Amino acid sequence: GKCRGLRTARKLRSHRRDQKWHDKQYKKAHLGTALKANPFGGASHAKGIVLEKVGVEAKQPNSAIRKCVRVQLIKNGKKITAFVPNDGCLNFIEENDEVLVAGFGRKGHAVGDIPGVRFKVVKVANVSLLALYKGKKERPR
Amino acid sequence: GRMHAPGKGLSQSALPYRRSVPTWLKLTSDDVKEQIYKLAKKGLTPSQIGVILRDSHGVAQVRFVTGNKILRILKSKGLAPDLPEDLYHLIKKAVAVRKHLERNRKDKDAKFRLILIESRIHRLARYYKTKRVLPPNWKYESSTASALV
Amino acid sequence: VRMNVLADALKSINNAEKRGKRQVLIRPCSKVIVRFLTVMMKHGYIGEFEIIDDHRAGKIVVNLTGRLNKCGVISPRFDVQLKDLEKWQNNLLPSRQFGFIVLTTSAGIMDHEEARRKHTGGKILGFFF
RNA sequence: AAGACGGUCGAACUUGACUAUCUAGAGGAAGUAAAAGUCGUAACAAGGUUUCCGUAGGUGAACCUGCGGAAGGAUCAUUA
RNA sequence: CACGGGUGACGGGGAAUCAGGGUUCGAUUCCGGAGAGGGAGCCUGAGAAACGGCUACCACAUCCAAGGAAGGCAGCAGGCGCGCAAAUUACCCACUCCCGACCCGGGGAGGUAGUGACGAAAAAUAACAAUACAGGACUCUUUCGAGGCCCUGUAAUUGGAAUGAGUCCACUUUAAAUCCUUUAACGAGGAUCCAUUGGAGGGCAAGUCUGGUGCCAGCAGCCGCGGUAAUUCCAGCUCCAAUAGCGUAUAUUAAAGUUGCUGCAGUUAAAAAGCUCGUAGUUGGAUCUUGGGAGCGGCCGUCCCCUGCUCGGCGCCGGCCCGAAGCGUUUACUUUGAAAAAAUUAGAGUGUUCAAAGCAGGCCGCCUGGAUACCGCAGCUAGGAAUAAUGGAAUAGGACCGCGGUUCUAUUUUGUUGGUUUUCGGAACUGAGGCCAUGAUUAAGAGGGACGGCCGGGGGCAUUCGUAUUGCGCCGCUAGAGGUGAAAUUCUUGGACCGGCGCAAGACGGACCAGAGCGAAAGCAUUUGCCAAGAAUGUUUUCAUUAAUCAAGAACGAAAGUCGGAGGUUCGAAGACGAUCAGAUACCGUCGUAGUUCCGACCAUAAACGAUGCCGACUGGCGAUGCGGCGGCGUUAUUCCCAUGACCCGCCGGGCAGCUUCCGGGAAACCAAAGUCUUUGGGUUCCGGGGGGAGUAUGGUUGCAAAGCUGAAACUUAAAGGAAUUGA
RNA sequence: AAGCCGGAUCCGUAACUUCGGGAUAAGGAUUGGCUCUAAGGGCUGGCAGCCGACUUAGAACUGGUGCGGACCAGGGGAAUC
Ligand SMILES: [Mg+2]
Ligand SMILES: [Mg+2]
Ligand SMILES: [Mg+2]
Ligand SMILES: [Mg+2]
Ligand SMILES: [Mg+2]
Ligand SMILES: [Mg+2]
Ligand SMILES: [Mg+2]
Ligand SMILES: [Mg+2]
Ligand SMILES: [Mg+2]
Ligand SMILES: [Mg+2]
Ligand SMILES: [Mg+2]
Ligand SMILES: [Mg+2]
Ligand SMILES: [Mg+2]
Ligand SMILES: [Mg+2]
Ligand SMILES: [Mg+2]
Ligand SMILES: [Mg+2]
Ligand SMILES: [Mg+2]
Ligand SMILES: [Mg+2]
Ligand SMILES: [Mg+2]
Ligand SMILES: [Mg+2]
Ligand SMILES: [Mg+2]
Ligand SMILES: [Mg+2]
Ligand SMILES: [Mg+2]
Ligand SMILES: [Mg+2]
Ligand SMILES: [Mg+2]
Ligand SMILES: [Mg+2]
Ligand SMILES: [Mg+2]
Ligand SMILES: [Mg+2]
Ligand SMILES: [Mg+2]
Ligand SMILES: [Mg+2]
Ligand SMILES: [Mg+2]
Ligand SMILES: [Mg+2]
Ligand SMILES: [Mg+2]
Ligand SMILES: [Mg+2]
Ligand SMILES: [Mg+2]
Ligand SMILES: [Mg+2]
Ligand SMILES: [Mg+2]
Ligand SMILES: [Mg+2]
Ligand SMILES: [Mg+2]
Ligand SMILES: [Mg+2]
Ligand SMILES: [Mg+2]
Ligand SMILES: [Mg+2]
Ligand SMILES: [Mg+2]
Ligand SMILES: [Mg+2]
Ligand SMILES: [Mg+2]
Ligand SMILES: [Mg+2]
Ligand SMILES: [Mg+2]
């Protein structure tokens, strides 16, 4: 610290209160402006209906067409772009069906070479997408 | 350092270790103080009463020849001033500077000084009021300060 | 200005000790500094010292040995119980074998070991090792 | 006993005001990111007019010019 | 830090993580509060503003013969809806308790079952031997090989022995049951009674194996992999990690000394207000009780002593010693004692088969346990008196000591009932006294002030001088002059430029002028006069803590700019023209408006820089410089010597700086401060938290305006940046 | 064109702005009669007596909710030129 007197407790504590707001991690946690902008509303997972299948080009040093999907969250109505994680899984996904969507690793931050997506599909039609990939289960018909 | 200046000076007086009256000084305590009274009757602050005593009469410090300081001698006799001499000279100086400002107003430097003399008065004024030598209602007014020099 | 006179004595001693000087001069003398310096003698960290006595706050000339590493003051003077005494010596002392905390109690200025034996805490002043 | 003058507590309704959150909007103007796009070359070397700060005016665009500053200068130095 | 606003806010005991500190959580079984769809009002009652009570309105909603009646699951189950997200419309009062008129009744309180990978403890998925094989220590053997006294592992080879998962007689448990425990009988060779989840470039333990694709598919938290020989994709094999578990998304804790009280940083990386003044806030110099005496042990360590004033007892001879009521600057601090619910945490005892647990159990009726520690802060109690505040006697309106009065006045006093007055005590005032050792710490290498001689491009007002520039008048001779890298626009026989003589105006104060001075910063340079101020030095003067830094607030603040007057020589934003050029709305040249100048008001911003807050202390040298003082051989001026000026040699105190250094620090450049820092704490103000978005939007406030101060978010991005090195 | 409002008292009052305004912004409540209560002063010799003159505020009662009862007596707001 700088002030060291035995009767400067109020000065030290009040200075700390002001200076915690310059911490980026603390500012977002203790202001709601970050949570309102969050599509999930603070939840870890969310369910939504599939509106379209969209492919996004990867960043410049890479060259690919990432398989994504446009969904509208049931609890909110907000549009998000979820990423179909594994290889060839996009064929299991058709239009206008219920999927379960979670985060994609970096807590609301873009991750990997994929430009501007935060989310990842984990379940479709109430069956896990990993079971579909391994052949353990089939789509519900 | 100085209260209202960037200088850091060291010039000051050094009292000798011995605090006894010298053997050559024959002026005694009882006949020291009536000389102080008559020099105060001429009209002289205690600062310059002691100045003209230790160069013309050999009395170095009246606190050693007499039992008390000069201002205590005067006030026990009733000749202490209405207000302390150090506060008096700040007020006399502020009057002189303030009078210079009404004659010429572009003197920005002279205006800046006026805060420094006035600030010293208020800092010194509240000290004497805690010591109960000035009344609690004593206030420095720039308009009426001229009358009391 | 000068707010603490013990902080100036310990710092002045440390500067002279760290450079290998034989004598150091503490400009203001107080009962606290004199009492702090005697605690520094019972354990052989300094030699004997003089108190030049003018009619003001006196001076002190200390005979320095090479036996001192760092003397330091703790400001402000916190109030420490005997339960908390163990923690303080765990932060500002090199090892459990040597080094002393000099703290003032109702029984006088004394080190932490001999304060623990008479079961009395107080306010910390400093340390040496 | 039903009932009535009055007093008190007072829900609810209508209107007005005030406040908080969200939301539409012709048009206008930014920011960011995709690009083998058009126009110049402003900054990096004395970057080819040294660079930069405050202010003011002007020009397709970078920018240019006036005044006073700084060296983060391309001089720690220039002689009776 | 009121008032207002927000709370993804019921409070607390507690929970998670943690060295020491802390951060986050606490709807949830205990205590307290509030509520029964939202409000409002009531009856009964000891107790209600009660809702498994009532009365209305509001929202919802049920039955109907259409007249009417009836409702309140945030009780147990169960249904819908909402969602990422949560169990049976089971059994019994057998236990713990509660209620009643009661030993006898009731209790969706509560208990027992069912669903249950929230999570916590224990623990299967093999053990052994023989054969071959491969090694090891043993011996012979230069080796091979040989013997196994001794091992060690491997092998869909062989061989028997031990069991639990499961089926199931029964007993035990229980209200009746189930489960656990017990025990008959079946129950294991590929013991198919067949263990998963993630990975194998690095961080990070483990294949440059093989096949497929070929910047596609895809992998990848990050750096990155993939374009026809992929250690990373899709697969087979092999290997690695934890193990009945493991991966993923999200909130949060440590890591984070990246929120720093312990314990960060601010020259160049992000950063110190342009500067000073200033009240709240923080912090505050020294100074008043020392020591002596007892005992033991070895000069030392431990223990003892250093305020008095109603009643009874070690009691003794009006007195003493002691005990008990109370009295006696106040705190802060520290030790002590009480009181502080359990549960939880720490912890004592105790073989639940061990453990998580529990409060039980042990011995041949008895012996027993069910402790203890912590529980901040605040409040209560008694010791200690260093440290830090605070008080006393200074117009004495002082402390003790007794004397003299006046007033009010308790009750012992007059044999037993009534009246006065004393003494007597208690309270108050007042007069004259005695006496104190009678009563004021020092005077800071803190500060304020006075004084003396100086000193300075410090400030204001007025005056005075200088050459130059431009313009004009006259005179002389002449055809070019200006500018450029080269030219041109430009002036020019109507005489330009050049030379002389004068006049007018407005700017500006060269050379002297320096790593020199002053000023808070901005800034400040001809002479002289006036006015006010100022540092430093000198001081045996004065007061005695009056101080340092400072939210809010206040004064000054270059240039540019804004508003009114005056003046406008030079230069010159805008503008016009001539060049240059691919273009040239520029650099270059000619002209030229606002401005630049003075006066009176605004504005408050600069690379306002030492890119470096202020106060105080300490830690190496050396030579100069400026101001003041002090001392000393000697030259020179006054002249007529003392004394003064100019030089020379030193010392002291502030000042702007310089050189050097293994003081020390730092990432280094470098810094005697940017040192005295993991050996971290002298005091205090401001301010930074990856790069952008952005000093932007919006709200507020100031301004005539331009603009100044305060100041986000969405979103985007693995870097941006500092110092130094080698190349180009 | 006619019509609505109109006085006074008590509340309440926006955008914008040249900070002067806007403003009677806009929008609400009251008003009769009767009987009382309190407050607001001069002269004479903190008290006593004697003189008074008009206003305000409050309260009870009361009428078929009627009361600036006739007369007098602003409709308002959002914008453009
Ligand atoms: Mg990359
Ligand atoms: Mg100050
Ligand atoms: Mg260029
Ligand atoms: Mg350039
Ligand atoms: Mg160029
Ligand atoms: Mg450059
Ligand atoms: Mg230009
Ligand atoms: Mg920079
Ligand atoms: Mg809540
Ligand atoms: Mg709770
Ligand atoms: Mg809740
Ligand atoms: Mg209730
Ligand atoms: Mg409900
Ligand atoms: Mg109720
Ligand atoms: Mg119910
Ligand atoms: Mg109930
Ligand atoms: Mg669940
Ligand atoms: Mg029962
Ligand atoms: Mg029963
Ligand atoms: Mg198995
Ligand atoms: Mg079983
Ligand atoms: Mg790895
Ligand atoms: Mg590895
Ligand atoms: Mg990997
Ligand atoms: Mg593989
Ligand atoms: Mg953390
Ligand atoms: Mg740590
Ligand atoms: Mg940091
Ligand atoms: Mg910087
Ligand atoms: Mg600065
Ligand atoms: Mg002190
Ligand atoms: Mg407890
Ligand atoms: Mg000159
Ligand atoms: Mg300020
Ligand atoms: Mg200016
Ligand atoms: Mg100007
Ligand atoms: Mg003008
Ligand atoms: Mg041109
Ligand atoms: Mg030009
Ligand atoms: Mg010109
Ligand atoms: Mg600035
Ligand atoms: Mg700076
Ligand atoms: Mg530190
Ligand atoms: Mg930042
Ligand atoms: Mg009309
Ligand atoms: Mg209007
Ligand atoms: Mg228009």
| CATH number of the domain bearing residue C34 | 3.30.1370.30
C62 and C73 fall within a common domain: no
Contact (CB, 8 A) for C48 and C33: no
Q: Give the whole-angstrom CA distance, residue B89 versus residue C56.
A: 30
C83 and C94 co-located in one domain: yes
The residues facing C101 across adjacent strands are C127
B85 and B137 part of one domain = yes
Residue B15, in any domain of the structure: no
Residues 84-113 of C, Cβ under 7 A from nucleic strand E: 87, 90-92, 94, 104-109
Domain identity same for B135 and B89: yes
B87 and B69 in one domain?
no
Q: Are residues C59 and C14 in the same domain?
A: yes
Torsion B2-B8-B9-B14 (CA) sign: positive
On strand E, nucleotides with any atom < 7 Å from a protein CB are 8, 20-21, 82-85, 198, 215-222, 224-227, 233-234, 248-252, 258-266, 276-279, 281-288, 303, 333-336, 383-388, 396, 440, 442-451, 458-461, 519-522, 531-549, 554-557, 599-601, 613-620, 653-655, 663, 675-677, 679-690, 712-718
> From chain C, which residues contact A within 8 Å (Cβ)?
75-78
Together in a domain, C100 and C114: yes
B87 occurs within a structural domain: yes
Number of domains in chain B: 2
> What domain range includes position B109?
81-149
Q: Which residues pair with A47 in a beta bridge?
A: A100
Output the CA torsion sign for B130, B136, B140, B145: negative
Which of C52, C68, C84 represents a domain boundary (last residue)?
A: C68
Q: Are residues C44 and C97 in the same domain?
A: no
Residues C58 and C13 in one domain: yes
Same domain? For C23 and C84 the reply is no
**How many angstroms separate the most distant Cα atoms in chain B?**
60
User: CA B109: distance to chain centroid?
Assistant: 26
Instruction: Tell me if B66 is assigned to some domain.
Output: yes
Domain count, chain C: 2
The experimental method, as deposited, was cryo-EM
CA dihedral A13, A14, A18, A21 (to 10 degrees): 40
CB A109 within 7 Å, strand D: no
DSSP B22: P
Q: How far is it, in rounded angstroms, from Cα B57 to Cα B27? A: 9
> Cβ(B125)–Cβ(B138) under 8 Å?
yes
d(CA A50, CA A70): 6
Cross-strand partners of A68: A54, A83
Q: Are residues C61 and C82 in the same domain?
A: no
The SS3 of residue B86 is helix
In sequence order, which ranges of chain B are alpha helices (DSSP H)?
30-42, 46-51, 62-65, 70-77, 85-103, 108-130
Three-state secondary structure readout of chain A: CCCCCCCCHHHHHHHHHHHHHHCHHHHHHCCHHHHHHCCCCCCCEEEEEEEEEEEEECCCCCCCEEEEEEEEECCCCCEEEEECCCCCHHHHCCCCCEEEEEECCCCCCCCCCCCCCCEEEEEECCEEHHHHHHCCCCCCC
C87 and C44 in a common domain:
no
Q: Please tell me the distance in Å from A6's CA to the nearest CA on chain C.
A: 6
Domain extents in chain A: 1-141
Q: A69 alpha carbon to ligand 39 midpoint, in Å?
A: 64
* Per-residue DSSP letter, C94: S
What resolution in angstroms does the PDB record give? Answer: 3.1
Q: Which residue reads 């001693």 in tokens?
A: C13
Tokens matching residue A135: 């052949």
Question: What's B66's DSSP letter?
Answer: S
Residue A33, classified by CB atoms within 10 Å of its CB into exposed (0-12), middle (13-18) or buried (19+), is: exposed
Token pair, residue A5, equals: 């007197």
Same domain, C64 and C81: no
Instruction: Give the Cα separation of B80 and B130 in Å (integer).
Output: 19
Based on the fold, state whether residues B95 and B131 are members of the same structural domain.
yes
Evaluate whether residue B19 is within a structural domain: no
**What single letter denotes the amino acid at residue B47?**
S
